[PDB]
């Protein structure tokens, strides 16, 4: 247990420590962290949410900052590192005020005033556009400091392409369910080998060799149960008194499997995707009848496939009518890398696509997938909101300048807290300077001037070695992620700032 | 700063534990595990998969450097050597405050330009096919303890691949499920031979089965030959002492029937992955059927391809369409052991190599060596081109990167020049290993390539820079592209990591 | 882990150590080693393969030399000790060259050149002969340094006799399956009591006292299954509701055993050798019917007996027809030592014989058997090849002289390696000198002169105390064993010489 | 305690280990060893005698090889490393013969035959010359693998110059007492700052400031006793009863010191070099009288100064007559580096010179002095003998070729030992190859040819990268050091080879 000053200085110190752990992942020039456990093992990522979710944080106050990795609205791209780094700075800047004699609650009030204002300023300054070109700029920016190679423009295009494929319009507004975009990976090298498929890709091979390699004009049956011998619930025991019965019993089984397959054939299905197992005898007769079957299909895939093909997931084969069958032009098995995967294409519903990522190393295809997923999210959000913000610390610099003025229009104590919040925002542009290896102090000096001359879009430029126009370089941040990164930071900093005793 | 200093040193350590095994004057490694298992080899893929690396950087170096995409010749040893070079050079550049991101861009670019130089300077295999491929297979065997018999083994490697290679779009495709490699000790390395057929290291299941069957109709099963017990709980209820006889009769009859079905369809041989009941063994024997059991799945797959049989799991539903074909199946004694040779298969693009060595650990390395040769010639046949060995092609790439660096000037340029110095790790290793003077060979090597001698390399025997293709030291174009591919990815991965946390 | 020089000097040292462990077993004056474990216990042998297979070798490099005990082509007689001792010397002689600066690979190349030449020279100098007299000289030589007593000439004769009995001619060539020669032992003393039987001897007594002690003109049934009550595979339970049924059930069993025996009698079999057990009631009725039965017969014996008598091993008694019965003039039980063994004689196939070894001590009958088995192998090989070589280090001396010259016809570095290989060969003649207790250095000097004067057959003679003509003394070595002992040694020395790092 | 084989193999192994410890110091391309203790500390040398004298050898057999560092006739220059490396090789080569069965005594006899022959061959092939030019070539060669910089030719010249200055002719022969060459060092940097002084340099300042900085035409008094108040042997106690006596007693002391100085002045001495201390009052009056005095002069210097100036070392001042005074033109004090040293020049005897070495680092001036001292020795020896030998392994190569032939003219066993001794000699040319980094095996091949074509002077040439004419390059070895290096090696190898038991 710790009380008062000792409790607070300690909590702040903890918050700062965890922020430092992710700090260097910020931006185009972000570094990676290698996280190693005991059994599973090594994870190498630049993703802040991944790093924090995996980290073995001990301290309670640090366990609280780490919780930002789970706020779905913030934990996408650099949102996580931005929220954590900012909480750290908000707590650090507070320490000074606590030292002067300012009460933790007025500091909390200042931050609330500041963040509410900032949330207003950014909706004011938010740039509108649903331009596919801007979408591409969102993705390019999202893929910036990752180990993806040079294929970024190629990836960015895939993203926009996938997003625009499943994006739909409800009452006047564009809604994009990312769950309709199936992303999967396979170790084959190249990356440029990533494919965009108009259908659902399934990491599953056909159960039996004699089954067709490709089915055209497919009537697809999605099945919930196992195509195996089922025993009754109330215990059952078979008693044979006639030696002749043994064969008959052995045959009822065969005939049971024969009927299963008859039911399936009767519905017109020519493809059977089973969520469970399929007995070898059933596989025998399915192949005999020419039906293409896959077994032990993931529920997630079962659901996406029902979505894409219009098929109803059926459990009782007796309810396997032609009404519950899905449709697709082609169901084909084809070898990808070293595996054989099933491709369901030309589905009844066009709003379903897949991205088969390639890249070799394994530990790269994973982050690349990790990357493509964030990219898909950010591009999806923007597609919806239609608004974005300038990157490279441009937003923070504007905010820092405005709040510095808004502080003056506020009363004594709160004013101090609001000037502290304004300083805290500079931790972002400074972090990008430091990471790129440029002089932090002078970049800030320049950045401040330009945004004050009205150059809203001037962020930190690695190239120009200092500040530069993000409008030209195309570095754009989605809005939603910004506002939530600020809000998360404030809510969490306040929670921690208010504690005066840890027992 | 430090996490990097440490990661890099862990990595380079792996690079050096493999360096002395590169080339004609390369040495092997003895790897002993905790369970006491011993593996003595020159194979860089086995060495890496074997060594107990603890450091996470080392584990990654091993995983990424593995040239996983293909294990042709010494791609992995070459990859690893270059990764260590690239890393060691990056250390220096970082001491000068060059941001790891510049370095990674530079490496990525130089890597691309290097693949280009290779495609460019490569050489298509022409009407010279046989002579080239032989020279390739020998170069490979030259690094191994198999050198001892390189001319004979090279011929075997050539004959085998040529036999199973399909010349499709005027192009060649080689399916390894047509090449059965089996090892048996108790013979000299020279006793190694190529058998036109599929050898299976197993013997007939029952002593009373025939030792040979001409014109065999082979049944390939995947199910065991035993009585089937119902799925629902089952109990025989005997109330009449007389039924006891009728019951056992019904069981034996079930087995007798299973054999009748297989035999009714014409089957002559029965090869199963699973087991064969003792009574079933009696019946097959009595029907004069040659049966082998508990066969390796991989062996099953190869027998299916060569005989054209289908692996059946439902004996009840077996048919003659399922049967495979071969002119003869016969049990032959290979040394101490008895093996089953399925010869004169339906599919004639099916071959076997019986690898011999006197000792177990000798025969093991011979198979490793021969499997390397097969992949070398096969990938050369498939790619259609070859590049000169002896460090020639690396000295060239190095030469051509130093130019390109000055074109892509700036900080990237430093990374690109460093990438060239790293590629030179190959000629250095080769020189060092043969007992030559690195700094001396390197200077001459640079001279020849500057003066346009693309194919000039290190003749470790004479210790002179000569024409590597003339001398026959050549390798598939694929080995170099993959090695530089794997090498740069492994180095970029470590270069980007600035912290290691649990 | 050890690298470079340390790794190599160490490996060589290890190889030498294990060679020393078997060294003194070489030749007519070889010593024995007592190997003691924990439970089973003491083994006393002169056999090098036995010693190494049993030895508790720790070092990896030593575990590699020990592998020569398993190379079936080398591990017969002194082949094992010759290969091990030579590997040790090849590695020892190499150490000198490594010291001078010679690369392990050129040393390996030298050895390859040397061994290939040697393999040629010995086929050149190999002496042809299929003369039974030479066969006898092969055996006498093979039995030389073993604790067999003076009975050697008597044993040698048994060997040739057995070998010539099963030896057969395929297309122009003599093939001898040693598996047709059944060797067994029984502790009764004497050794001269060893018998040569024209039939199969089986260490098994007849199951029942009332069964005949001897059967003439035997129709032998070989049976795979147990002559016992068999339960069904699918569980079976008997339910008795009538007290009267209990007897009936108890009787069905008796009648079951009665029928078993009826089937056997119906085929005309009058002897039944069962691989498994025989119920007491079955034994009752078999004895009642006069059939001689043995049970729990080894599969090895089952197989040899099927081979010798022409009987088909049957599992299902219903397939016990007169067609599957074997034949033999006499099946008699007779007491050997303290046991009662069954003798199957005058078999349909004459190419099957047995050797019942006697000798008392137990620990002697074992090595004697160990001896007779090697002797049988060597005599069998020679019977086939028709060629042999002079013993007592005569071959090595010739080789050492020739390769010493062939070295000159070779280039610098390799030449050194080939002169090293030539020196290594002298380790054999020297080992025989040392073991006999004579001066090594002078025997070699003399041996070299005589072989150089063209006396190819001069080996080390204990009697003449120095060198002497092996042609006269009759010491001959089979060819196959020589070539493989050289080849094994070279392959293994190269494997070890190439290692520069042990991790 | 160890007996037989174990004792011998072990002793040989030990000898080899210590040879390895100095091996790399051989030649122009020799490396240095850093020897570190507990208190005094670090020593860095290339000198083999120094390294071995300092080494902490544990093993007895190794303590025996190390004894060669004390054989004054061998331990000069590379003589030590040559003797040690050769003993190691002689013992190593013997091990092979012991293995074959050769008795340690005949091996010892072989080596004796071999070395006696070799000692003859080198006197036969020894090149005569007292040419100052050759002397310079001896020094240049002696200074070869040391950290002396490039100043070697400058140093070599100093050496010859000093040597020729003190060299004297007795009955027809030149004798050179090196003890007449005073070598000293002072940390001032440069090396080229080393001076050649025609007089004795003394690391001592004048005792009193008021004493002259320079004395010309000096009559030098060398004094053994302290110029201090001496108490009687039989205890003495002073008893004062008159207060007035105290002054008188205090004055007798002053007057005592006054007389001391009077005696000195009376002899005409104007310089006083005292081996002991000088009281402050005595210093007072000496300075007053104008006599230049130095105190606590080393006995070694006292002796050299008596030698150079003709002064008689006097203990009782009453025997300080003008007859015992030495002479020198100038006695001057001058600052060298940071110290002030006294220079006694133009001594009565010209056969005395000094070399004041400079070089900075301290740890360099020490080895340089260590170097100059060996150089002086070798140049001195040759000056006397008038004969030398070609360097770079040329001598050993000739010897190895001749003894290889002389072996043939000898009986069996000894012949083997003599061929072993011939091989052992090649360890020198091979060591120079290895150190220079060139191929050992091929250099030897070439070296053998050339010496066999009659090219006696062909040694190992770093430049020509292989072999080359030492006659042209000027690499010459003194004779005496060669013969003793061979002899030491043989005597010590025999001592060790003869031990069969260490208790």
From Swiss-Prot, chains A, C, D:
**Which Pfam families did the record assign?**
Cpn60_TCP1
| PTM summary | The N-terminus is blocked.
Q: Please provide the record's keywords in A-Z order.
A: ATP-binding, Chaperone, Nucleotide-binding
- Indicate yes or no for the key word Chaperone: yes
* Gene3D superfamilies reported in the protein's UniProt record: GroEL, GroEL-like equatorial domain, TCP-1-like chaperonin intermediate domain
GO MF entry, a single one: unfolded protein binding
Q: Which domain of life is it from?
A: Archaea
Q: What cystine linkages occur within this chain?
A: none
Oligomer status and interactors: Forms a Heterooligomeric complex of two stacked eight-membered rings.
By sequence similarity, the record places it as follows: Belongs to the TCP-1 chaperonin family.
Purpose? Molecular chaperone; binds unfolded polypeptides in vitro, and has a weak ATPase activity.
Note the NCBIfam families from the entry: thermosome_alpha (NF041082), thermosome_arch (TIGR02339), thermosome_beta (NF041083)
- What is the protein name for this chain? Thermosome subunit alpha
Write down the species: Thermoplasma acidophilum (strain ATCC 25905 / DSM 1728 / JCM 9062 / NBRC 15155 / AMRC-C165)
Lineage, highest ranks first: Archaea, Methanobacteriati, Thermoplasmatota, Thermoplasmata, Thermoplasmatales
UniProtKB/Swiss-Prot annotation, chain B:
Q: Which family does it belong to?
A: Belongs to the TCP-1 chaperonin family.
* Stated name of the protein: Thermosome subunit beta
Q: How does it assemble?
A: Forms a Heterooligomeric complex of two stacked eight-membered rings.
Leader sequence range is: none
SUPFAM superfamilies named among the record's database cross-references: GroEL apical domain-like, GroEL equatorial domain-like, GroEL-intermediate domain like
Q: Which UniProt keywords apply?
A: ATP-binding, Chaperone, Nucleotide-binding
Q: What does this protein do?
A: Molecular chaperone; binds unfolded polypeptides in vitro, and has a weak ATPase activity.
């Amino acid at each position: 247990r710790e009380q008062g000053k000792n409790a607070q200085r300690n909590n702040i110190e903890a918050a700062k420590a965890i922020a430092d752990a992710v700090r260097t992942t910020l931006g185009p020039k972000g570094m990676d962290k290698m996280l190693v456990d005991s059994i599973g093992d090594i994870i190498i990522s630049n993703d802040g949410a991944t790093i924090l979710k995996e980290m073995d944080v001990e301290h309670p106050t640090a366990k609280m900052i780490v919780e930002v990795s789970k706020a779905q609205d913030t934990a996408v791209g650099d949102g996580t590192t931005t929220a954590v780094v900012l909480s750290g700075e908000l707590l650090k800047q507070a320490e000074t005020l606590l030292d002067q004699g300012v009460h933790p609650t007025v500091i909390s009030n200042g931050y609330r005033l500041a963040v509410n204002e900032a949330r207003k300023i950014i909706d004011e300054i938010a740039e509108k556009s649903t331009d596919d070109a801007t979408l591409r700029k969102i993705a390019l920016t999202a893929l910036s400091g990752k180990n993806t190679g040079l294929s970024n423009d190629f990836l960015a295009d895939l993203v926009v392409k996938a997003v625009n494929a499943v994006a739909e319009v409800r009452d006047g507004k564009t809604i994009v369910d990312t769950a309709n975009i199936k992303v999967d990976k396979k170790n084959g090298g190249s990356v440029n080998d990533t494919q965009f498929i108009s259908g659902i890709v399934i990491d599953k091979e056909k159960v039996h060799s004699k089954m067709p390699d490709v089915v055209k004009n497919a009537k697809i049956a999605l099945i919930d149960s196992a195509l195996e011998i089922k025993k009754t619930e109330i215990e059952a025991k078979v008693q044979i008194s006639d030696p002749s019965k043994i064969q008959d019993f052995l045959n009822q089984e065969t005939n049971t499997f024969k009927q299963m397959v008859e039911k399936i054939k009767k519905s017109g299905a020519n493809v059977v995707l089973c969520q469970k197992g399929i007995d070898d005898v059933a596989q025998h007769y399915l192949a005999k009848e020419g039906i293409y079957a896959v077994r032990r299909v993931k529920k997630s895939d079962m659901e996406k496939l029902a979505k894409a093909t219009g098929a109803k997931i059926v459990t009782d084969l007796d309810d396997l009518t032609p009404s519950v069958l899905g449709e697709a032009e082609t169901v084909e098995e084809r070898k990808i890398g070293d595996d054989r995967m099933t491709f369901v294409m030309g589905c009844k519903n066009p709003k379903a696509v897949s991205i088969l990522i390639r890249g070799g190393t394994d530990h790269v295809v994973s982050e690349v997938e990790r990357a493509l997923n964030d990219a898909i999210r950010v591009v999806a959000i923007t597609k919806e909101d239609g608004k974005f913000l300038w990157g490279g610390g441009a937003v923070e610099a504007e905010l820092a300048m405005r709040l510095a003025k808004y502080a003056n229009s506020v009363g004594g104590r709160e004013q101090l807290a609001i000037e502290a919040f304004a300083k805290a925002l500079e931790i972002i542009p400074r972090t990008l300077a430091e990471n790129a290896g440029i002089d932090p102090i002078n970049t800030l000096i320049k950045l401040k001037a330009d945004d004050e001359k009205g150059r809203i879009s001037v962020g930190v430029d690695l190239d120009n070695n200092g500040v530069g126009d993000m409008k030209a370089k195309g570095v754009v941040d989605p809005l939603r992620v910004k506002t939530h990164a600020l809000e998360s930071a404030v809510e969490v900093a306040t929670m921690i700032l208010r504690i005066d005793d840890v027992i | 700063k430090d996490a990097m200093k440490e990661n890099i040193e862990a990595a380079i350590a792996i690079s050096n534990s493999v360096r002395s095994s590169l080339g004609p004057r390369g040495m092997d490694k003895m790897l002993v595990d905790s369970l006491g298992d011993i593996v003595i080899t020159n194979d860089g893929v086995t060495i890496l998969k074997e060594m107990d690396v603890e450091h996470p950087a080392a584990k990654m170096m091993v995983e990424v450097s593995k040239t996983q995409d293909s294990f042709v010749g010494d791609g992995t040893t070459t990859a690893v050597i270059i990764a260590g070079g690239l890393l060691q050079q990056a250390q220096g550049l970082i001491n000068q405050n060059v941001h790891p991101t510049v370095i990674s861009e530079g490496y990525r670019m130089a890597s691309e330009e290097a693949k280009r130089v290779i495609d460019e300077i490569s050489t298509k295999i022409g009407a010279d096919e046989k002579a080239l491929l032989l020279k390739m297979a020998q170069t490979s065997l030259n690094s191994k303890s198999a050198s001892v018999a390189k001319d004979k083994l090279a011929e075997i490697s050539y004959e085998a691949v040529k036999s199973v290679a399909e010349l499709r779009d005027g192009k060649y495709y080689v399916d390894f499920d047509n090449i059965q490699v089996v090892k048996k000790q108790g013979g000299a390395i020279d006793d190694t031979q190529l058998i036109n057929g599929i050898i299976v290291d197993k013997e007939k299941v029952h002593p009373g089965m025939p030792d040979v069957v001409k014109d065999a109709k082979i049944a390939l099963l995947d199910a065991p030959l035993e009585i089937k017990k119902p799925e629902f709980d089952t109990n025989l209820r005997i109330e009449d002492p007389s039924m006891i006889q009728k019951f056992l009769a019904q069981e034996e009859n079930m087995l007798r029937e299973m054999v009748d079905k297989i035999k009714s369809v014409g089957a002559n041989v029965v090869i199963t992955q699973k087991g064969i009941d003792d009574m079933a063994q009696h019946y097959l024997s009595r029907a004069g059927i040659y049966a082998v059991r508990r066969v390796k799945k991989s062996d099953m797959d190869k027998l299916a391809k060569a005989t054209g049989a289908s692996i059946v799991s439902t004996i009840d539903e077996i048919s003659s369409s399922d049967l495979g074909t071969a002119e003869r199946v016969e049990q032959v004694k290979v040394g101490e052991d008895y093996m089953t040779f399925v010869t004169g298969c339906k599919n004639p693009k099916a071959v076997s190599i019986l690898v011999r060595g006197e000792t177990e650990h000798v025969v093991d390395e011979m198979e490793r060596s021969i499997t390397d040769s097969l992949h070398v010639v096969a990938s050369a046949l498939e790619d259609g081109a070859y590049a000169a060995g002896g460090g020639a092609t690396a000295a060239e790439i190095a030469f051509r990167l130093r130019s390109y660096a000055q074109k892509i000037g700036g900080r990237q340029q430093l990374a690109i020049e460093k990438f060239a110095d790293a590629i030179e790790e190959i000629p250095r290793a080769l020189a060092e290993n043969a007992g030559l003077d690195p700094i001396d060979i390197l200077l001459k090597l640079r001279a020849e390539h500057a003066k346009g001698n693309k194919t000039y390399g290190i003749n470790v025997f004479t210790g002179e820079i000569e024409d590597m293709v003339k001398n026959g030291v050549i390798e598939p174009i694929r080995v170099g592209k993959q090695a530089i591919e794997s090498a740069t990815e492994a180095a970029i991965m470590i270069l980007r990591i600035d912290d290691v946390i649990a």
